[PDB]
Amino acid sequence: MDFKTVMQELEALGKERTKKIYISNGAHEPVFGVATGAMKPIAKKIKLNQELAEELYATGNYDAMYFAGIIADPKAMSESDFDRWIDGAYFYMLSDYVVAVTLSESNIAQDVADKWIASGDELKMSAGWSCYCWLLGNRKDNAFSESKISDMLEMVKDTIHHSPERTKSAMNNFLNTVAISYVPLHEKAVEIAKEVGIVEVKRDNKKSSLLNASESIQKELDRGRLGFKRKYVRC
Amino acid sequence: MDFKTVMQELEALGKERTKKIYISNGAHEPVFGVATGAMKPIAKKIKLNQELAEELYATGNYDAMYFAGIIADPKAMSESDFDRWIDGAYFYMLSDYVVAVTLSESNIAQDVADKWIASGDELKMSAGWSCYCWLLGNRKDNAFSESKISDMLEMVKDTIHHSPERTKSAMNNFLNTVAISYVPLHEKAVEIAKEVGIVEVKRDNKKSSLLNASESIQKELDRGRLGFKRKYVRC
């Protein structure tokens, strides 16, 4: 399995309806429209290869870029590498579900995430908040500072409604994840979600997403998932 | 590990925050309030033990009962054994997340689930519909007859709004799961959900839940989860 065969199989796996959805979300050609679950068999056959990942990411093809994140070697990627990737994440599916998930598995996750949240750039900030969501699922609470997370909750409470569209989404995912995956602040997260209320994420040529963190949190509790931690399911 | 050791360790893991929520969901004493993640290393040491599972299930303690499901041997459990268990499942967390999940790993899942769905008993039916949701995420489509699943979708449309509260919740989960995990009927499921509209699940001591299968299915599609099959995570 190399670049050639991967690009060929990915294309074969694509479908028109999944393709229209991605494009609907902000993706642009080239794109095949591959459902994530279909990549598991290919992933299984490829050992982390940063060279291959780079090549795939460089195609500018969303599906290939998504797959690149799966087979990347995050422990070998430097801050510089991540800035190259994030600079190529043209829409949220890339910044939140690809770059941020990969970063969450590096040794510099929090440092990069933090500079990105402070960058003032919508997608970079979105990837940053997103990274924290994945981190809270990958690591024990003991790997984080309670006061830091707590100050982040307050920042979200005071600024989510005025943040860039994509950033609001990531920030809302942060509220949910802290409430469910970082129990030390469960009560506060619930309290702030109630204070935040409905968060609207405006989208191009489609109904905006009306996010309800309080509701989401409550649904997770109904499923008995308080304290539930798990890595992001990539495929 | 023996019964006594397992019960000690479970109690040692109990925490008030978790317990409070379980009781809020419907559990009653005796209950410790154990986070499922912490049961993983314990179950790993036990693997399968039906005798221990039975002893644990008979305690009437939610956590012990939940753990019993994890270490059970569903391939050795008969239809009568499953009926004993469902008779002890006093609330949805037991019927849907314990009995239904264990059943989904047996060789008689569908026959039993079908009997339960037709039983007319709120919790047995809830377990039946839940079982199918778990089956759809842990098995290839070749395991399900399209004609049969399609009839089940019709049955949901014509009976969900008048169904017992917990059955309604499980039926709504069926709609969502078929739409995403069983592609042969993705359009049909999407259609049935549109016709069904908002599903309300009442629950004393709390404001009724207003389920919107159409939107949920849409959020999954947006992320590229069409055809995605996720095996139920017990711990």
Q: Quick one: closest CA in B to A233, which residue?
A: B230
Q: In whole angstroms, give the CA distance from residue B109 to residue B111.
A: 6
Q: Which residues of A118-139 are buried (b: 16+ CB within 10 A; e: fewer)?
A: eeebbbbbbbbbbbbbbbbbbb
Which of A18, A93, A226 lies at the smallest CB-CB distance from B21? A226
A21 with B227: Cβ contact below 8 A:
no
A35 with B223: Cβ contact below 8 A:
no
A209 membership: H or E segment, kind and range: strand A206-212
B208 contacts chain A (CB < 8 A): no
Q: In whole angstroms, give the CA distance from residue A173 to residue B47.
A: 35
Q: Which two tokens stand for residue A205?
A: 């040529």
Which of B25, B222, B226 lies at the smallest CB-CB distance from A224? B25
**Distance, in angstroms, between B84 CA and closest chain A CA?**
23
Q: Are B226 and B190 in contact (CB under 8 A)?
A: no
A 10 A CB-CB count for A198 gives: 12
Place of tokens 């994945």: A134
Which of B126, B192, B182, B131 minimizes the C-alpha distance to B156?
Answer: B192
Can you give the residue range of the structural domain that contains B44?
Answer: 1-235
Technique employed here was X-ray
Q: In whole angstroms, give the CA distance from residue B65 to residue B85.
A: 9
DSSP B3-33: HHHHHHHHHHH--HHHHHHHHHHT--SS---
Q: Is the dihedral of CA B219, B225, B228, B230 positive or negative?
A: negative
User: Where would I find the H helices in chain A?
Assistant: 3-13, 16-25, 40-44, 50-58, 62-71, 79-87, 92-94, 100-103, 109-117, 122-138, 146-159, 165-181, 186-196, 213-222
A43 contacts chain B (CB < 8 A): no
A18 with B226: Cβ contact below 8 A:
yes
**Distance, in angstroms, between A227 CA and closest chain B CA?**
7
DSSP B180-232: HH-GGGHHHHHHHHHHH--EEEEETTEEEEEE-HHHHHHHHHHTT-TT-----
Q: Are B119 and B82 in contact (CB under 8 A)?
A: no
Resolution, given in Å to one decimal, reads: 1.9
A228: buried, middle or exposed (CB in 10 Å: 19+, 13-18, 0-12)?
middle
Q: Are B172 and B160 in contact (CB under 8 A)?
A: yes
A36 contacts chain B (CB < 8 A): yes
Q: In whole angstroms, give the CA distance from residue B110 to residue B130.
A: 11
Q: Which residues of B148-176 are buried (b: 16+ CB within 10 A; e: fewer)?
A: ebbebbeebeeebeebbbbbbbbbbbbbb
Which of B208, B130, B234 minimizes the C-alpha distance to B176?
Answer: B130
Instruction: List all residues 6 or more positions away from A25 whose beta carbon is below 8 Å from its beta carbon.
Output: A91, A92, A93, B222
> How many domains does chain A divide into?
1
**Distance, in angstroms, between B18 CA and closest chain A CA?**
7
B35 with A219: Cβ contact below 8 A:
no
Cα dihedral A126→A129→A133→A134 (10° resolution): 70
